[PDB]
Amino acid sequence: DRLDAALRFQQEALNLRAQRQEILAANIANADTPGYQARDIDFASELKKVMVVDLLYRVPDQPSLDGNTVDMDRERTQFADNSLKYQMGLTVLGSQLKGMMNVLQG
Amino acid sequence: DRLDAALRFQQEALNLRAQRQEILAANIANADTPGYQARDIDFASELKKVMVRGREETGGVSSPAVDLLYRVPDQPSLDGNTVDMDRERTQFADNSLKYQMGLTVLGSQLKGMMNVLQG
Amino acid sequence: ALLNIFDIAGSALAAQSKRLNVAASNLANADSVTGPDGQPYRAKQVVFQVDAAPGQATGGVKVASVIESQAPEKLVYEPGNPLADANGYVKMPNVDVVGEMVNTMSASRSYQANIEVLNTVKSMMLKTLTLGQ
Amino acid sequence: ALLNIFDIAGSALAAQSKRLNVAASNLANADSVTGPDGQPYRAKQVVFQVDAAPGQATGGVKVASV
Amino acid sequence: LLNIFDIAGSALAAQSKRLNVAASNLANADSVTGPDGQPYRAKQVVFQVDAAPGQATGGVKVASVIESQAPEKLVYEPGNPLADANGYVKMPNVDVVGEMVNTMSASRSYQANIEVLNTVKSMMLKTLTLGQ
Amino acid sequence: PGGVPGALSNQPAPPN
Amino acid sequence: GVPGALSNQPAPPNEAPIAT
Amino acid sequence: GGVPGALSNQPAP
Amino acid sequence: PGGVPGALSNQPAPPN
Amino acid sequence: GVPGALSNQPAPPNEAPIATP
Amino acid sequence: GVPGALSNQPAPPNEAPIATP
Amino acid sequence: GIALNDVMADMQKASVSMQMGIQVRNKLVAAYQEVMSMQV
Amino acid sequence: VSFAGQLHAALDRISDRQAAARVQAEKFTLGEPGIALNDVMADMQKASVSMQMGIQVRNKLVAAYQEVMSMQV
Amino acid sequence: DHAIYTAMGAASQTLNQQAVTASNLANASTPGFRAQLNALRAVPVDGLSL
């Protein structure tokens, strides 16, 4: 359907933002697990792949003794950024749907 | 001619409202620029002027032929701008309501005419 | 001529965003000692000008250029740090933290004011589009 | 990825965390006689550089090495 | 209700002026000299009713800014160049508690006036849709 | 008319 | 001039010197 | 231009 | 002629 | 490379011995 | 004179003397 | 350039004038057909 | 050149503006540097206003055509 | 909106005065030292209208 092609990009971006949000929250929740590696996804490459998931390990900053590589500050900033981008995607998708609607209303 | 003349006052007042709001938005944008005197226009005198002699432009960079007057500052500032934010936001809201009033009056007149014509 | 408010407020938003970014960059490097070239970090500030071409009455605002702040470099006596002076006077940036925090707050407030201007202007444009209907 | 302000402030947070970690490790090892190999502990320092991604305009803080 | 806009704007200006005076006074609690060498005398705004064509009720206008007449504080620093023949340097009579309370009350009045103006503007907006 | 608002007026003063 | 009124002449540049 | 905005994507790509 | 907004242009500048 | 980047390899285990092996 | 009501006559000016004289 | 304020106002004015012309012509045509539908 | 040509030009202009705003939004969502959220949001706003203008013009034009076709000959 | 700048100037100059005082205190053992006096001058901004 042509309607899907117009809204495909924003829907895929929104779904990818939700998945990465879940991954970041999993990183936050498992901060205290000894031996847990902080995982993340490269948003742009996966968005290419879906439009046309694989988890990448985060490069550790400080060496802990229990093997936990989760850094609070980095993932807190990433979490806030992902929340903001999810809201922006919701706004853009809603604007596109509302425009398609006011075209029809009459 | 007759219909153009009957709807000309409110149309010109609404255009002058738009230009005054552009000026007020420019004042709000430059509110933190050092060395910017706030500008505003006398709505009534400029409205009568546009009424008697048609609208004109300086060039056409183009701009209206309105007289950009300086607002009297309230209290001094070291940077040297006279944009007092309370005055700016009060004039902005007042101009907003008056523009909506002009839209309402013009729309009412135009319906008041389609009512006659429609049959 | 309500469309020009879009340009005016968009330029104002961009300029305030640039000013906030510069202030945050200065604040985050208050404790820096070295630059990419080895030079000490110099506190930087934007310059605001009226975005009016010759013959234009009133426009928005534009960032002319970014300039190094005029203030003495903060001298620290640490002649043990590998970076030092002839007499061990490490040069640290001249960032005034209170000024940067106040600048950040002011930029945020001006940004929000411009957003309100844009919102009400769009509402008026829609209402004008509903003139006779 | 990150918005510019987010990246700058998050880099600042990470750099301050690294400096605090270095200070804490130094304060812990204030009375250490030997390491794991037989050499004295040496006080660590952290060097802040400006991560000027564009030409001389802005940038957060990075830490080259301890 | 446009006169209400005039009233609210004038009152916002007056309360902002009072807040600015209080902030300047609080900054200069410990100031010892000005440009001319005279002590800083604390400033106070004067409020007056702006009802010139509106009978006895109207907005509030700041008539003037006046130096407070409370006696200047005296500090014994005979080595100070500003010390007189008796060796007393004049320091401002700014009351810290009074200025803090003035700032707080001015802020509250400012917010109340803003809420009044918003309610009046909303009422005008709804009046614009009479009979429809 | 009116006078200084706030601290100065709402403070007891010598009669004059 | 009354503050908040309109005048055709600009306000003079204001300065705050430290020493007269 | 020389300065990227605060609300722009990391200049570092 | 504009200038630097905020802290720099609202602090008492040097005489010259 | 940079702390906070993305790599396809898990970091090596974080061992801290008390004596030299 | 009920508080909160409306009266034709203005309220008398209040006074706070430190001394009776 | 021309703003929505002018565009909408002239657009409405043209709609009004066109409606007036249509109504006046309809009245004239109805009168003519009533005259010609006569019986002499 | 003609009325149909002018209407086609207006439709092309509106569609081009909308596509430009959409492309900039997708570029921002992509993570490419230099694209500011301010510009994205303002351009989306402008595109919405232009779409609404086109809708109003279409509505009136259709109303005028219906009025003309209702004329009795 | 500009009282924030007055207060910020006051706070920054308080920081400067504190720096002067700390520099004076750091030299409590310096042989033959003369303490630096500090004083907050008030600069009144000229202009209109009040």
Which residue of chain A is at minimal alpha-carbon distance from D20? A62
> What are the residues whose beta carbons fall under 8 Å from the beta carbon of A9, sequence distance 6 or more?
A51, M26, M29
Structure-token pair, residue G17: 């010197």
CA distance A43 to L3: 42
E96 close contact with F: CB closer than 8 A: no
Is the CB of residue C108 less than 8 Å away from at least one CB of chain D? no
- Chain C partners within 8 Å of I5 (Cβ): 19, 46, 48, 106
Q: Name the residue of chain F whose CA is nearest to K21's CA.
A: F15
Contacts of M31 in chain A (CB under 8 A): 43-44
Interface mutation vs chain A, best among J14, J15, J18, most A CBs within 10 Å? J14
Cis peptide before J7 (omega within 30 of 0): no
Backbone dihedral angles phi then psi of residue A92, each to the nearest 5 degrees: -65, -45
Report CA-CA distances (Å) from A69 to A62, J4, J14, L5: 7, 10, 9, 61
Resolution limit, Å: 3.3
The pair of structure tokens assigned to N11 is 């706070």
Interatomic CA distance for residues C119 and C126, integer angstroms: 11
Contact yes or no for E35 and N7 at CB 8 A: no
φ, ψ (nearest 5 deg) of residue B6? -70, -35
Q: Which experimental method was this entry solved with? A: cryo-EM
Residues recorded for chain M = 73
User: Is D50's CB within 8 Å of C32's CB?
Assistant: yes
Q: Do chains J and A touch (3 or more CB pairs under 8 A)?
A: yes
Tell how far CA A28 is from the center of its chain: 14
C120 touches chain B (CB under 8 A): yes
Q: Can you tell me whether residue A44 is helix, strand or coil?
A: helix
Phi and psi based region of residue M69 (left: phi greater than 0; alpha: psi -120 to 50; beta: remaining) = alpha
Q: Which of L11, L22, L29 sits opposite M68 (nearest CB)?
A: L22
Q: Largest Cα–Cα distance of chain I, in whole Å?
A: 20
Q: Using DSSP, state whether A78 is helix, strand or coil.
A: helix
- L8: contact with C, CB 8 A cutoff: yes
Pairing mode, strands D48-51 and D60-63:
antiparallel
Q: How many CB atoms lie under 10 A from the CB of residue C117?
A: 24
The verdict on a CB contact (< 8 Å) between L29 and M73 is yes
Burial of B91 (0-12, 13-18, 19+ CB in 10 A): buried
Q: Which two tokens stand for residue E100?
A: 């803090």
Angle at CA of residue B33, ends B27 and B38, nearest 5°: 30
Q: How far is CA E41 from the centre of its chain?
A: 15
Is the Cβ of B86 closer than 8 Å to some Cβ of chain G? no
Q: Supply the angle between the helices B8-29 and B43-52 in degrees, to the nearest 10.
A: 140
Task: Compare all CA atoms of chain B with the CA of N3 and give the residue at the minimum distance.
Answer: B77
Q: Where are the alpha helices (DSSP H) in D29-63?
A: none
Residue I12's region, left for phi above 0, alpha for psi from -120 to 50, else beta, is beta
G3 interaction partners in chain N (CB closer than 8 Å): 48-50
N residues 10..39 contacting G (CB < 8 A): none
Judge: C35–D52 Cβ closer than 8 Å, yes or no: yes
Q: How many CB atoms lie within 10 A of CB B109?
A: 16
Q: Which residues contact B71 (CB under 8 A, 6 or more apart)?
A: B37, B38, B39, B40, B82, B87, G4, G5, G6, G7
From residue K1, alpha-carbon distances to A99, K4, K15 in Å are 63, 9, 19
In A30-104, which ranges are continuous DSSP H helix? 43-51, 72-104
Q: Give residues 12 to 51 of M whose Cβ lies within 8 Å of C.
A: 36, 38-39, 42, 45-46, 48-49
Q: Which residues of F touch E102 (CB under 8 A)?
A: 6-7
SS3 content of chain I, % helix, strand, coil (to 5): 20, 5, 75
Please tell me what DSSP assigns to residue E72. Answer: P
Neighboring chain I residues of N2 at a CB cutoff of 8 Å: 10
Please answer yes or no on whether B72 and N2 come within 8 Å at the CB atom.
Answer: no
Residue E38 CA to residue E34 CA, distance in Å, equals 6
* Interacting residues of N50 by C-beta distance below 8 A, sequence separation 6+: B74, B75, E17, E45, E62, E64, E65, G3
| Contact of D7 with H10, CB cutoff 8 Å | yes
